[PDB]
């Protein structure tokens with residue numbers, strides 16, 4: 001049916017964090033970015049309806065934010081909210097972008113933001129060109145916010161936030177379809193030396 005779009009999560013994997021080695025120069029200095037996860041993408045965060053639509057995606061982070069940190073993703077520098085994972089000593093920062101490669105990375109540093117098209121953040125009438133899917137790219141870096149144990153650190157799967165689907169077709173907009181933005185759990189490997 002015309003509006004039978006269905007949500008699909010976008011996920012990024014703890015297991016891709018490189019081994020974290022902290023030497024005497026950066027030991028006990030907080031906060032500090034300790035590594036980036038492999039960036040991911042999902043073309044079909046919303047997909048399925050038979051009638052094409054002009055769509056946009058609004059992201060809302062849902063973890064507690066405890067501070068800010070300046071960072072430039074390897075995948076200018078910007079401020080990012082540091083979100084508390086619930087694991088002592090570990091925070092995360094988030095960036096997101098449109099699925100299409102030319103769209104810019106959007107730092108997560110506010111209560112909610114349109115990740116694509118970014119024009120919608122200053123124009124409430126701005127949507128993506130009409131098509132059958134809405135997708136995104138996801139970027140995450142881990143932050144040492146405090147002492148971490150040596151060895152393997154278990155990181156449970158966490159929901160980072162959700163994307164709300166909006167459209168200039170009211171019947172689709174009124175569904176308030178939402179898709180989870182997920183950090184798949186894993187183990188970080190951490191070595192700390194003085």
Ligand SMILES: [Co+2]
Pocket residue numbers: 027028192194
């Ligand atoms: Co120490």
Ligand SMILES: [Co+2]
Pocket residue numbers: 189191
């Ligand atoms: Co080791």
